[PDB]
Amino acid sequence: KPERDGLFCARIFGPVKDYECLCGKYKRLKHRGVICEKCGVEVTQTKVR
Amino acid sequence: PPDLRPLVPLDGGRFATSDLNDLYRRVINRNNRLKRLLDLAAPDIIVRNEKRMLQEAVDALLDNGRRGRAITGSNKRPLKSLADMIKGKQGRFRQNL
Amino acid sequence: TTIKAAKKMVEREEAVVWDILDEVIREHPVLLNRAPTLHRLGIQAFEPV
Amino acid sequence: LTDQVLVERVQKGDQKAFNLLVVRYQHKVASLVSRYVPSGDVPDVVQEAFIKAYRALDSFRGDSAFYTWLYRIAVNTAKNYLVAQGRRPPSSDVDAIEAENFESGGALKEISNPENLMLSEELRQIVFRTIESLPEDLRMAITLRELDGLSYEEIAAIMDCPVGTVRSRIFRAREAIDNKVQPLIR
Amino acid sequence: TPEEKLLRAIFGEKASDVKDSSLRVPNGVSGTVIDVQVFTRDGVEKDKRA
Amino acid sequence: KSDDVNGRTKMYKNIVDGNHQMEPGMPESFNVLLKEIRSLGINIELED
Amino acid sequence: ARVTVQDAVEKIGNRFDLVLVAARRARQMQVGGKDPLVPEENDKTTVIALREIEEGLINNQILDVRERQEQQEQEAAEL
RNA sequence: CUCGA
DNA sequence: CGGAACTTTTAGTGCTAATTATTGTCAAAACCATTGTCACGGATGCAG
DNA sequence: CTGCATCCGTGAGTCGAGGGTGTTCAATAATTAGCACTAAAAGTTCCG
Ligand SMILES: [Mg+2]
Ligand SMILES: [Zn+2]
């Protein structure tokens, strides 16, 4: 898993897996396009990175 | 972007790594130490040598081999800078376009 | 009907793909290429048999 | 000039006194640490040893000279950097251009074919036709469950049904999906 | 694969299922198996063939 | 056949449907070169 | 039968618009369900289009007025 | 490092 | 296909114990390869 | 102020095959990776 604010991140560049956040709280299609409570990552595909 | 300089787990002890990552880590470490030295009221020559190290890291990251001595990470071989990733017979203008 | 059955029929190597292969390479030329290419006559077109 | 008057002056408050020590000792420290750490990362750990020597000069009791103190600080910072590098992944182990054309490449190569995407769209069309041609209550339950992520209590309150018949409906919908989608995956 | 990625995006992530990642014969070669060598780390149980 | 992300899939869909018709699109390795040049201090932009 | 293309070059002496008009005719034959004028011998649309160039009924002038006539008749029948 | 062109 | 008993889990609370990065330094403290390629332009110092 | 000569940056073909490595003191202050305990929600057979 990448670091919180290092060279490899999630809130700066994007999510690692397709339609799955880093925390694992939001994984369904209903939460597609919203951020979390602590990480703050817009969940999307891996092509954003 | 991290998709252009990937760092991935390779099966077993081996890891697959890009060259630029170490230079980026050195630049980030020198910038953090330069931000921490100016607050604690350091003498002038310590932050002067820190600025010299940061300038050496910056112009080694931009084009390695144009300074007074090309720095190396391992294998007695120079690391591949962003200018070295364009030039040569392995850059984008000769291999992938 | 689907492409999965056609893929399985191609992979199984039946005797019903061969007349289709003779039908699609009737007048379909291919480009041949030499790995050293000095002048323009190293890349020509030919009809396969 | 000796070093006792200089360390007494910088303990007294002279900020321009440690420079005369560092311009006499920095080449010796940069030559000492370079035997333990690699030659590319010498000035960061040498200057970090200099910072940790400047920030702990009041604890110098004066039983010895400054050179053995700076020597022990330099070797300890070199071994601490070696430990921190042992915790870090290697920086130049395997090149990335020699990684795609190699066995067991996870993220260098991707299993994405134009025939695979067309087969994925065909399986999507097949499972969308498999969702249809069903009774309305099972289709309504499976579209309220697996297309929205709702819980069992909302489906039990909306459809006017208990929990167990919703479990039976989603089990029947799942086997009605899996009797068709599983022969297409082989 | 995308045919598994679509199923995982619709109804997946249970974690019980296992993918088929096995060693297979390459396309073109047709050989006869004459020797099987099995090396095992200490502390790991072994099957009957080993 | 080599570079387009959304061009080879549409060409594969059009070939099996009986339509020899391609789309130009845009290559992706040129975007990699654009991101590599843009990572330096040199700005490069595509106009109207 | 297609082994030479030299007479089609002698018809339209540019050797670059021949590929354009043949691709236009083969696209009108492949996409749209049109009738080939020359009788076929179970050949592809490339051979049929090249033989239509060879017989002199198809060039860069017939296709434009044919598309204009098709547009005029579809605007008349659009109502 | 090496092999054929 | 409609129901309750049966059974298996992916999420929320904690809690102790290996991974994290820190403090010390106070007899003194002799140090990487290179080195067996060729051929252009042109910005540089002397050095009159 | 018109030239001398001394270095410093550029480069030196293409297409396939096999095989792939890094130079360590002690003792801790916080710190987070397993892991027990519920959670009935969610999943899986079974009787009309
Ligand atoms: Mg030969
Ligand atoms: Zn999250």
Side-chain angles (χ1 to χ4, degrees), chain E residues 13-16:
Chain E
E13 104 98 350
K14 33 172 46 63
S16 82

Short mmCIF file of all heavy atoms in Angstrom, two decimals, chain E residues 13-16, chain I residues 8-11:
data_model
loop_
_atom_site.label_atom_id
_atom_site.label_comp_id
_atom_site.label_asym_id
_atom_site.label_seq_id
_atom_site.Cartn_x
_atom_site.Cartn_y
_atom_site.Cartn_z
N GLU E 13 -15.86 -9.60 -4.92
CA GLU E 13 -15.07 -9.30 -3.73
C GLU E 13 -15.39 -10.19 -2.52
O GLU E 13 -14.99 -9.88 -1.39
CB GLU E 13 -15.16 -7.80 -3.39
CG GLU E 13 -16.05 -7.43 -2.21
CD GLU E 13 -15.25 -7.23 -0.93
OE1 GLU E 13 -14.05 -7.55 -0.92
OE2 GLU E 13 -15.83 -6.74 0.06
N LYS E 14 -16.09 -11.29 -2.74
CA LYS E 14 -16.44 -12.21 -1.66
C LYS E 14 -15.18 -12.75 -0.97
O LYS E 14 -15.16 -12.93 0.24
CB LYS E 14 -17.32 -13.35 -2.16
CG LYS E 14 -17.02 -13.77 -3.59
CD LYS E 14 -17.79 -15.03 -3.96
CE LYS E 14 -19.25 -14.95 -3.53
NZ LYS E 14 -19.98 -13.85 -4.22
N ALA E 15 -14.15 -13.03 -1.76
CA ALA E 15 -12.87 -13.54 -1.25
C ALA E 15 -12.79 -15.05 -1.04
O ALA E 15 -11.79 -15.56 -0.54
CB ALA E 15 -12.47 -12.80 0.03
N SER E 16 -13.83 -15.77 -1.44
CA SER E 16 -13.83 -17.22 -1.32
C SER E 16 -13.29 -17.83 -2.60
O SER E 16 -12.57 -18.82 -2.58
CB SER E 16 -15.24 -17.75 -1.03
OG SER E 16 -15.99 -17.86 -2.22
P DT I 8 -20.50 -23.31 9.00
OP1 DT I 8 -19.83 -24.45 8.35
OP2 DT I 8 -20.34 -23.12 10.46
"O5'" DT I 8 -20.05 -21.97 8.26
"C5'" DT I 8 -20.41 -21.77 6.89
"C4'" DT I 8 -20.31 -20.30 6.51
"O4'" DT I 8 -21.27 -19.53 7.28
"C3'" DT I 8 -18.94 -19.66 6.76
"O3'" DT I 8 -18.51 -18.96 5.60
"C2'" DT I 8 -19.20 -18.71 7.93
"C1'" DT I 8 -20.65 -18.32 7.66
N1 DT I 8 -21.35 -17.76 8.85
C2 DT I 8 -21.85 -16.48 8.78
O2 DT I 8 -21.77 -15.78 7.78
N3 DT I 8 -22.47 -16.04 9.92
C4 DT I 8 -22.63 -16.74 11.10
O4 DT I 8 -23.21 -16.26 12.07
C5 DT I 8 -22.08 -18.07 11.11
C7 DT I 8 -22.19 -18.93 12.34
C6 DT I 8 -21.47 -18.51 10.00
P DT I 9 -16.95 -18.85 5.24
OP1 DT I 9 -16.76 -19.42 3.88
OP2 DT I 9 -16.19 -19.40 6.38
"O5'" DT I 9 -16.69 -17.27 5.15
"C5'" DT I 9 -16.83 -16.46 6.31
"C4'" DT I 9 -17.57 -15.18 5.99
"O4'" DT I 9 -18.70 -15.04 6.88
"C3'" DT I 9 -16.72 -13.92 6.14
"O3'" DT I 9 -16.90 -13.04 5.04
"C2'" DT I 9 -17.21 -13.31 7.45
"C1'" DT I 9 -18.64 -13.81 7.58
N1 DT I 9 -19.03 -14.05 9.00
C2 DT I 9 -20.07 -13.33 9.55
O2 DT I 9 -20.71 -12.51 8.93
N3 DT I 9 -20.34 -13.63 10.86
C4 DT I 9 -19.68 -14.55 11.66
O4 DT I 9 -20.00 -14.75 12.83
C5 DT I 9 -18.60 -15.26 11.03
C7 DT I 9 -17.81 -16.28 11.80
C6 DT I 9 -18.33 -14.97 9.74
P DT I 10 -15.62 -12.52 4.22
OP1 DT I 10 -15.78 -13.00 2.83
OP2 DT I 10 -14.41 -12.89 4.98
"O5'" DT I 10 -15.76 -10.93 4.25
"C5'" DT I 10 -16.73 -10.27 3.43
"C4'" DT I 10 -17.29 -9.03 4.12
"O4'" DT I 10 -17.64 -9.34 5.50
"C3'" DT I 10 -16.37 -7.82 4.19
"O3'" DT I 10 -17.15 -6.63 4.15
"C2'" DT I 10 -15.71 -7.99 5.55
"C1'" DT I 10 -16.87 -8.53 6.37
N1 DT I 10 -16.47 -9.37 7.52
C2 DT I 10 -17.25 -9.36 8.65
O2 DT I 10 -18.23 -8.65 8.77
N3 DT I 10 -16.81 -10.18 9.66
C4 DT I 10 -15.70 -11.01 9.63
O4 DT I 10 -15.39 -11.72 10.58
C5 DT I 10 -14.93 -10.98 8.41
C7 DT I 10 -13.72 -11.85 8.26
C6 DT I 10 -15.36 -10.18 7.42
P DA I 11 -16.53 -5.26 3.60
OP1 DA I 11 -17.30 -4.88 2.39
OP2 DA I 11 -15.06 -5.42 3.51
"O5'" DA I 11 -16.85 -4.20 4.76
"C5'" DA I 11 -16.39 -4.44 6.09
"C4'" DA I 11 -17.34 -3.84 7.10
"O4'" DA I 11 -17.70 -4.84 8.09
"C3'" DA I 11 -16.78 -2.67 7.90
"O3'" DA I 11 -17.83 -1.82 8.30
"C2'" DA I 11 -16.14 -3.38 9.09
"C1'" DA I 11 -17.14 -4.51 9.35
N9 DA I 11 -16.54 -5.72 9.91
C8 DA I 11 -15.58 -6.50 9.32
N7 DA I 11 -15.22 -7.53 10.05
C5 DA I 11 -16.01 -7.43 11.18
C6 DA I 11 -16.13 -8.24 12.33
N6 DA I 11 -15.39 -9.34 12.53
N1 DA I 11 -17.00 -7.85 13.29
C2 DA I 11 -17.73 -6.74 13.09
N3 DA I 11 -17.71 -5.91 12.04
C4 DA I 11 -16.83 -6.32 11.11
#
